[model samples]
Target: YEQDKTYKITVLHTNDHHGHFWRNEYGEYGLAAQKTLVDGIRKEVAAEGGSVLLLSGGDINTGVPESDLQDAEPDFRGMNLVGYDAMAIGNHEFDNPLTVLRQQEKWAKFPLLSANIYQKSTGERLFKPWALFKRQDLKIAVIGLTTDDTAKIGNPEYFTDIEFRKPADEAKLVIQELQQTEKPDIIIAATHMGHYDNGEHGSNAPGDVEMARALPAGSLAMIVGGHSQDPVCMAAENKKQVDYVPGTPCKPDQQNGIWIVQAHEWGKYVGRADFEFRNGEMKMVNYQLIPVNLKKKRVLYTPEIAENQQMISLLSPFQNKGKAQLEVKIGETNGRLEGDRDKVRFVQTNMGRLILAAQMDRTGADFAVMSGGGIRDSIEAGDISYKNVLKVQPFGNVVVYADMTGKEVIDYLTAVAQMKPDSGAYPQFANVSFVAKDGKLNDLKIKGEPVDPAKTYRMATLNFNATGGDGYPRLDNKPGYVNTGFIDAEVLKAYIQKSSPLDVSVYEPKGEVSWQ
Candidate 1:
């Protein structure tokens, strides 16, 4: 017997929610407005005889103190109200403890999917590998995969009990299992692995594009992904849209017959894909990434989407609780500290110096070093708030210190200083001076004093760098290494409060570091 009926299905997705349950000061991309937008799409799709499946690309934790303080309870519950069907587990899911992630799973209405993460002791998958959905007489299998880089980049304390397997290999095995047991008609992937254009991951683990390339053509109908956090718009095959502007039409990246889509981050856009399936052949008929109350140049980028009142009421208490703690003025800055991605990652800035000063003061180290990528936002002049400090160091990395001989310090700096410019790994320093030439440091000095090869000196930095995040030298197990047990944000906040009426000029670089 031959099946003759055509089926219409619409897939809606978002990723890297990063705890933005409430809208920002600009009133953009809140769950309330997101609910309104998604509900409207569901209604429209139903009218057209199509069913909808809403999925998240994972990373629902970290960022924004309001959500982080409460373990992202509002964010998960808010997703339930927005009607998410499932989500992939992101590396940040391990930011807290395994118990916290288990609690979050209880809070979510849908299943958290990740096929490659396993409990090392039991040798079992930690989360559901995939979920099968019945949409319009078709069985669609949505497989979930996480990047294996989590082993190196995640908090080391929590990762010892778990193991991360390569995602592409796991995807193949999971698909085979589905074929033998369930015989799915359409296969899709909801992955937390990033989307690298033309599979040029560059020091990062292979991402969705590479996975699609490795698999047979049409093995996956599409990939809904997160982590790289780009808009996932393509200008041509393997070529990404270089400068994607909000509210513009987006063409999803397609590789090996698998369409790859990511909705940027923080619920900024909802990606909608309309597909028609006829006689086992699936085709994407239309697609778009709709902005949620996004703006450009102080003007509305698209017609505004209204917020759902029920969702606003459900989430307001969490927002208010966090605002009370974060809004209290911590101190004031006389001038803006430059920490913008473009500014901090490219050159030395006052913001970098200020962060190092806080770490050094906390640990009483001779000098401190940090990566430019760790600084997220710049502090503006005038009233400094707790939230402002949190914005700068939102990753929850602990401040740490290590004692090293002058020779050891010189070698470490030699490696760190060589990190490529215009990336998060770019070096930031305090009380240290050096000239970098030919990938080696020359004329290195600490606090304006020449280094003595036999003298031991203390260096301060975050646990992220200490444990090899961004390819930094591992210092956690080194001699005299100590985890200060102080959060980076809180340390910065205390420094700002202690130095109120702050003079930003004190943190400005003074020819301490130069490249030749």
Candidate 2:
């Protein structure tokens, strides 16, 4: 029997919006502007009279005031405006801690999918793995997977309760299950794990590509991806795909049946792919990667920038009443205060030394110590406001009063000084100095005096370091420490604001030390 049939589906997707609530230097994808752009696009899609599906490749949490304002609250407000039909989880979604992940799961209007993440103790799927959507007579199965490194790249406390599994293996199993149960006419995998050839962390190289190559002959129509933040749109095997264009390299396969696509980070662009199905088989007919311009007339928010204003207002209450008292500015710096491993591991900077000096001065302790990683970013020489100081030292570590034999202090320095200087590990110091050669600690000095091993010394440090992070195993479980509620960021900010309009040149390198 001969019959005539026709159907069309349009997929609109975005990745890594990153809560950009303010105007960027690029003049695009900022707050209400992005929302306006999205609304306009949706209206246009509706006008075209086709079945439309809105998707997100994850990373909807954190980054800016719009998304991060409520600290994982469902009515967090910003996410409410930018609606999504289905989403794959991104690593940052776990940033606020696993409890928040559960809350978001409960509150999200759309289905959140991640096929591989599991609870370690129970070995059960932590969230819904995949979803099936029917548009007209065609059945669309959308499966989701998160990046395998969700636990490693984020703060350990955030994901201590969950375990992330390999994506490709899980995706294959889910797709097979969907095929046997539903026999959907098309399958779309909305994955946070990007293309393998893109060289993104956790991207199953050869695995993702091989999965595309081995798609069960008649199933698995397309893959939409996120993470790696690489913008791409092309065909691979039998699918049309899009991913955030990574800040790095990209190798895509066009001749294959799959077409891949991605929008750049921060809502800068919307990836659109139109699919046509004939006789139970689907193919990509047309594709466009459209830039979402804030300047466009169709943008929903304009000169008022309502979304940006609303987000700023929402965050102001928290910033003003919640933590303003703690954000007193302290002092200033001439040179940029950087916290790279090479700098922190061997040399003491103006900020590091100054922070330690403040702790020593405040507590009248003989010495102080902190982990290199505790210092988050570099402070640019400028007005040096309280906010600037807090940004550099974001972690609210407290000063702990501790009694250590000068010998233990020496050993602590020796252990940390011996750490291999790399991107991830570094040493930060206070009221102390030491030299390392041939993997041995030597020439130790505290407050410009030679350290006496037998002498008892009063020292100050954060709980993490007192417990030994960054391979400083000696400090762990050692007793005689008292915690003072002086948050490091608050102390530093106080010092900066009191010395406002800081002179960057005032910061001179302190405490000469080196490693062989």
Candidate 3:
């Protein structure tokens, strides 16, 4: 069958919607703003004789207080209203469990895809790897792939029962099959594999660039990426090595020739790229990020989406229920506890220190390790409440203890340090201090004493990290792992009630560990 008509298509995408339910700083956030922006795009594309396809790079679970408090339902309903063609399966989507993901699939109007994730025991494809969206007989095939980091990032126990195949490997097979059997006019790799910067991190899974290199030239028209949570739009020209420029506004790293794009995390930004197909091939034009800007002038060559009250209405249930619970004052902070996701994910923050200290205090562990990614939002000086604590640490991870040699802890710290610049694996600890220099762990101490490399130590972390999530393979599945049977939120609540009115005024990290 030969197709004859030339078609113009616009694809709008977002990645890592970590449950930012309420309107954020931009004044243009939440589903109301998103609906406005997306609807405007749809109308614009339609005006230009093209149709817009809405897509996501995955991870619509576990971040804000409302959606996460109710197992990501508000987010599901929001996206359902926003409407998407498809979304790649992010490792975090599996943060809850297989059953939870299956239930979420039912909630979403579109399909959640992962062409490579398979049932380990039976070697069966976990979900449909590819989905076809057609307009005017023009077939645009979206092949989905999840990040390989899923193996060690979420609850590993939930994943030990399955297999996450390499995405590049799967793409080679799936794309070829689609080309031969399905005859798609264009192939878009909607993936949670991440947009790597100039260098690769500790993750072994093939990133977007690697996957682009693996695919035959012209095999994939575009790659939508996430997990790195960067606002990147790179074009792979003839599968060449990427050399990016870094800054924005017409400045592309201009290094990679393959077309790959990703919006930053949360509901902060949306990405749109135009593609024109002529003679059975697609050409991309104007790949850019659309911030959910409140100011009309702030929107780039785009219209301001008017806030929709009806859309806002859908989220009130989650918002109102959480507000009452989160509003009750539990204590006071002399200083703000910094829990900003971006800030905490890379550097040690007061909020991280407080939570880590609380965990260690709750369990009587010698030292505790927590990832900055685990802390969601910062707290201001003054009154604190159960909700504020929940916002800071909401993954519902239970406390757990692991016995490890001092050398092992140092090794893990060193590994985490190498994951700097973007990854959320940056380690934060309590009752432990370590100096990181030249990309290695050294001068480690616990309780003011030097760490004995050969000596075994009791270490504390959330159940998520204990399962080797966030690239800590050696920490989980080791000897002497025990659950402390205390939820992180509960532990923090108890600590606050006991140790308040909290004096963050002179609060310095108590032997807190981090890479310099």
Q: Evaluated with lDDT, which candidate comes out highest?
A: 1
What C-alpha lDDT, on a 0 to 100 scale, does residue 68 get in candidate 1? 75
Tens digits of lDDT, candidate 3, 1-516: 246566888989988887776786556567778887888888888888887888899988866556655668888888988888899998778767788888999989999999999988989998999899987667789999997767743125477558888888999999888978988878888998865554353334558877776677767877887876667744443222233222234222332345777777777677888887888767776776777653443443345556767778988888888667666777888898888877776677778778877877755578777777778788899888887777777677878777678888777656766666456787666766777788776777777788888888777789888787787655545655655445688678767878988888445664355566
Runs of candidate 1 exceeding 4 Å displacement: 327-354, 357-428, 431-442, 445-516
In every candidate, how many clashes are there?
Answer: 0, 50, 16
* TM-score of every prediction relative to native: 0.74, 0.60, 0.68
Q: Write the per-residue lDDT of candidate 1 for residues 129-234, one digit (tens) a residue.
A: 9999988678888999998877654124588679999999999999899999998988889998998779988656889999999988888889999988889999
Displacement of the residue 412 alpha carbon in candidate 3, Å? 13
Ranked by TM-score, the better of candidates 2 and 3 is 3
- In terms of lDDT, model 3 sits at 0.74
State residue 66's C-alpha deviation in candidate 1, in Å: 0.9
lDDT-wise, the better of 1 and 2 is: 1
RMSD of each: 8.9, 12.0, 9.6
Per-candidate Cα lDDT values, in order, are 0.89, 0.62, 0.74
